[PDB]
Write an enzyme that holds these catalytic residues in place. Structure first.
Site, mmCIF file in Angstrom:
data_model
loop_
_atom_site.group_PDB
_atom_site.id
_atom_site.type_symbol
_atom_site.label_atom_id
_atom_site.label_comp_id
_atom_site.label_asym_id
_atom_site.label_seq_id
_atom_site.Cartn_x
_atom_site.Cartn_y
_atom_site.Cartn_z
ATOM 1 N N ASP A 1 0.824 -1.208 0.000
ATOM 2 C CA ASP A 1 0.000 0.000 0.000
ATOM 3 C C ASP A 1 0.851 1.248 0.000
ATOM 4 O OD1 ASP A 1 -2.695 1.216 0.647
ATOM 5 O OD2 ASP A 1 -1.530 1.931 2.391
ATOM 6 N N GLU B 1 1.579 -0.146 -4.863
ATOM 7 C CA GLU B 1 0.540 0.785 -5.130
ATOM 8 C C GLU B 1 1.103 2.189 -5.070
ATOM 9 O OE1 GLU B 1 -3.130 3.365 -3.854
ATOM 10 O OE2 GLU B 1 -1.861 2.514 -2.321
#
Ligand SMILES: [Mg+2]
EC number: 3.2.1.141
Length: 580
Positions: A262, A295
């Site tokens: 993330d 990401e």
């Protein structure tokens, strides 16, 4: 020649000893003057080894409950492998050797072979558990996806949440199941030939349950912060090792095939070897085929070429597609014009912003880098994911936004699923699910009240703390049986089989992919030694005959798949066709 920093002998937390001798407890603290471990209610003073390392061995086994006591204060273990009573409770000692794996004939999955299917365990089934998810695996296998992408599993506070409030990174969130239930889900997936990837959050800790600073404030720094918490100090080796040991646990001990990291722009590190590079070294040291994906919004190829990650969630495509279909312009969507020519360009370049000015108010800068080094699989494309749905005030799906037809939705699927880039689908997308995916949480006390207030202010908007917001996000598995849900599902099945079977769509080279437009008609052409394919997508509100689309090559004659099942080479508004 890279050597792991990790040795089971010195592993922090609670680790079973060989020969049935019990459990070794270890911690690091920079500040405590008294240090004990409380096991099943009894306090034992730990041995000081120097460097702030404390250890004790006791003849207790898996299942024993424990926490640490620092200057008299009972404190959860940040290295807990399971937290049956939640993030403020005792940990349980876990033995990773007891599970009987059956996946010795599974050897991972290559990125170029991935079609990701993003699952949120809490909403994916009524039960909201790994066990219930596992019963949907045959459906996913038959659907034609190849890799499940699981939203974060680290324990967080409350009874539901997306996972980005994870605080005990090593402890799978108890409401979803016990460690062996997660293992069983991964083993089942592998026995069906599906890969399993995990979303992990190494840029921040959640706002309840993170006790690392009770042990050592120097896990963190005031040198920087994210939007979501104080900064993780990657100049501190114990902080580096907290995340690299976590990555290794998921991959080795749970048999995950890869990780999705993330918000990698916010993993700030000025060290000689960046933490992203060291993550890749540490996972590679395991001697498997595991993948790492970032990401990352920066359009920075170095994540692949320097840090040695495998690919990047690259959302310019998603955004371009959504703006094409809706014309919306709020927030980051103001970065994109949309339309057939715009979409042809973003595909051609992989991402749009390669250094040009990003003019979005409040965010202005020169964004991105040249994409030339990256090959098609390195780009992970989608038209839906947890954020691109859940970040919306009402959590509506693409087909649920104003002005979007199911025909347009189905054409978008055809585009995504015929491109050589690595596609991701969100749970339920494949049947045009009727349910939103809204932001939900369940924090206690004042924190909970602030979540509700914050959501209200940032944008009626559903209260994230309400049970109903969670329940309204649950998938309805009945609805795929009928009507337009079933028609959409048959298209997704047809697309996924062609992707698997068509010898030209097997292409994974950008050298063989060209794009263009004629008015509101997008074209995407693949040419390999196996032949030629062209996808045409009519993004207008009129009808366009394929014969009248102006192309710089001869259009192929044979209709392979029409998104509305038509017999003739004509595209109604929003429709697509693949020819060869
Ligand atoms: Mg056995």
């Amino acid at each position: 020649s890279f050597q792991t920093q990790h040795d089971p002998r010195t592993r922090l937390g609670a680790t079973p000893l060989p020969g049935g001798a019990g459990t070794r407890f270890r911690l690091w603290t920079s500040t405590a003057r008294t240090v004990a471990v409380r096991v099943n209610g009894t306090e034992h003073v730990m041995t000081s080894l120097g460097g702030g390392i404390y250890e004790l061995e006791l003849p207790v086994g898996p299942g024993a409950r424990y926490l640490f006591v620092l200057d008299g204060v009972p404190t959860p273990d940040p290295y807990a492998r399971f937290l049956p009573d939640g993030v403020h409770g005792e940990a349980e000692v876990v033995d990773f050797g007891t599970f009987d794996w059956t996946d010795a004939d599974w050897h991972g999955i290559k990125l170029a072979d991935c079609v990701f299917y993003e699952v949120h365990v809490g909403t994916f089934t009524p039960e909201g558990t790994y066990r219930a998810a596992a019963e949907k695996l045959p459906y996913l296998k038959e659907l034609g996806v190849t890799a499940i992408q699981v939203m974060p599993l680290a324990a967080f506070d409350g009874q539901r949440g997306w996972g980005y409030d994870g605080a005990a990174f090593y402890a799978p969130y108890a409401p979803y199941g016990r460690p062996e239930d997660l293992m069983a889900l991964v083993d089942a997936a592998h026995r069906l030939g599906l890969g399993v990837f995990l979303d992990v959050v190494y840029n921040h800790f959640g706002p309840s349950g993170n006790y690392l600073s009770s042990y050592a404030p120097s896990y963190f720094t005031d040198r920087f912060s994210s939007a979501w918490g104080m900064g993780l100090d990657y100049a501190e080796p114990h902080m580096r090792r907290y995340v690299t040991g976590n990555a290794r646990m998921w991959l080795r001990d749970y048999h995950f095939d890869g990780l999705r990291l993330d918000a990698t722009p916010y993993m700030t590190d000025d060290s000689e070897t960046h933490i992203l590079t060291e993550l890749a070294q540490e996972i590679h040291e395991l001697g498997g085929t595991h993948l790492l994906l970032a990401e990352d919004h920066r359009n920075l190829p170095d994540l692949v070429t320097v840090n040695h990650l495998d690919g990047i969630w690259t959302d310019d495509f998603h955004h371009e597609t959504r703006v094409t279909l809706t014309g919306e312009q709020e927030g980051y969507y103001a970065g994109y014009r949309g339309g057939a020519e715009a979409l042809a360009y973003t595909i051609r370049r992989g991402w749009r912003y390669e250094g040009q000015f990003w003019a979005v108010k409040g965010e202005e800068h020169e964004r991105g880098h040249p994409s030339d080094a990256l090959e098609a699989p390195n780009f992970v494309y989608c038209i839906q994911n947890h954020d691109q749905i859940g970040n919306r005030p009402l959590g509506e799906r693409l087909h649920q936004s104003d002005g979007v037809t199911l025909h347009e939705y189905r054409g978008a699927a055809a585009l995504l699923l015929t491109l050589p880039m690595t596609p991701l689908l969100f749970q339920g997308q494949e049947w045009a699910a009727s349910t939103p995916f809204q932001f939900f949480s369940d924090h206690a006390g004042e924190l909970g009240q602030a979540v509700s207030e914050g959501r209200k202010k940032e944008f009626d908007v559903p209260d994230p703390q309400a049970e109903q917001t969670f329940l309204n996000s649950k998938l309805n598995w009945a609805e795929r049986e009928g009507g337009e849900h079933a028609r959409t599902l048959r298209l997704y099945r047809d697309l996924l089989r062609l992707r698997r079977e068509d010898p030209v769509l097997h292409n994974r080279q950008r050298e063989n992919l060209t794009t263009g437009h004629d008015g509101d008609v997008l074209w995407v052409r693949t040419v390999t030694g196996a032949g030629e394919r062209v996808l045409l997508w009519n993004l207008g509100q009129d009808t366009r005959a394929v014969a009248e689309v102006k192309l710089p090559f001869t259009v192929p004659r044979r209709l392979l798949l029409h998104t509305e099942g038509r017999e003739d080479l004509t595209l109604g508004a929003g429709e697509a066709v693949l020819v060869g």
